[PDB]
Amino acid sequence: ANSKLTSDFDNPRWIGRHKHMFNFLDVNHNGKISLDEMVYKASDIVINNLGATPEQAKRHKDAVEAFFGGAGMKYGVETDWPAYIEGWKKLATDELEKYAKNEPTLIRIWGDALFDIVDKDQNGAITLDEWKAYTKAAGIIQSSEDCEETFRVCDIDESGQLDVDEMTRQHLGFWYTMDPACEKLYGGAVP
Numbered sequence: 530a531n532s533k534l535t536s537d538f539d540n541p542r543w544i545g546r547h548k549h550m551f552n553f554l555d556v557n558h559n560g561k562i563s564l565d566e567m568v569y570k571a572s573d574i575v576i577n578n579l580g581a582t583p584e585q586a587k588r589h590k591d592a593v594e595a596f597f598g599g600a601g602m603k604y605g606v607e608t609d610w611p612a613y614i615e616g617w618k619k620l621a622t623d624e625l626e627k628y629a630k631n632e633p634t635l636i637r638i639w640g641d642a643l644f645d646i647v648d649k650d651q652n653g654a655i656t657l658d659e660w661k662a663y664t665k666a667a668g669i670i671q672s673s674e675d676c677e678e679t680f681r682v683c684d685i686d687e688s689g690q691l692d693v694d695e696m697t698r699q700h701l702g703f704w705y706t707m708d709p710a711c712e713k714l715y716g717g718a719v720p
């Protein structure tokens with residue numbers, strides 16, 4: 530493994546990062562969300578906003594299913610916040626265990642599915658314009674200034690693109706470990 534990654538689950542900034550996303554996902558403020566909702570959102574984005582082919586979409590659907598599945602979410606079950614954060618602890622642990630063993634993470638598998646859609650050249654790397662299009666469709670970032678910040682935090686190549694290898698490392702830090710160097714990955718959009 531290239532980094533030594535450990536969890537920080539009692540940090541209120543980690544709990545609150547995921548609470549921010551819970552709220553963002555719970556668009557109708559039911560105080561619960563379902564797997565049905567999460568995979569609908571994923572496929573709506575990629576099929577109806579980003580031009581994914583049927584095969585590309587199904588590959589993406591499987592990845593998103595497995596991801597939220599790893600956090601304990603299930604079709605036909607309504608997950609509340611206390612269940613959600615408990616499930617996220619299990620997902621993060623499981624992911625850091627894979628990473629430490631140089632085994633592919635659920636977030637990497639999602640990223641490969643998504644980048645094949647979003648990268649016009651299908652080489653595992655995105656432009657700023659492609660990142661805006663995705664994050665704005667998803668709604669995880671709203672402003673162009675915040676998308677721009679992603680490219681500052683991340684280590685870009687001579688060509689000016691964001692490689693899947695680099696994004697994954699940042700994602701591991703941001704979502705799973707509270708690594709200080711990954712702060713502001715989505716700019717002001719997600720604390």
Ligand SMILES: O=C1N2C=C(c3ccc(O)cc3)NC(Cc3ccccc3)C2=N[C@@]1(Cc1ccc(I)cc1)OO
Binds near residue numbers: 547551640667
């Ligand atoms: O990393 C990403 N997340 C993480 C999250 C996320 C993380 C933690 C959390 O508690 C909730 C959501 N959400 C979204 C948006 C989303 C949500 C549901 C269905 C479709 C798109 C999300 N989109 C992603 C997609 C992605 C996935 C892997 C890679 I490497 C690069 C990009 O962009 O930052």
